From Swiss-Prot:
Its cofactor is Fe(3+). It comes from Desulfovibrio desulfuricans (strain ATCC 27774 / DSM 6949 / MB). GO terms for molecular function: electron transfer activity; iron ion binding. One of its GO terms (cellular component) is cytoplasm. Belongs to the rubredoxin family. This is Rubredoxin-1. CDD domains: rubredoxin. Keywords: Cytoplasm, Electron transport, Formylation, Iron, Metal-binding, Transport.
Amino acid sequence: MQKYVCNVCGYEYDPAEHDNVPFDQLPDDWCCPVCGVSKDQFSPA
Ligand SMILES: [Fe+3]
């Protein structure tokens, strides 16, 4: 499943590590757990 990386801090969201919850299901108020930016500052990776 499509992984995304934080442009600012390099954190990588891998659905497989979160019970197969895809990036597109995360809430509008979700932010990077390392640096706090919103989903719009992530890139497919
Ligand atoms: Fe980040």
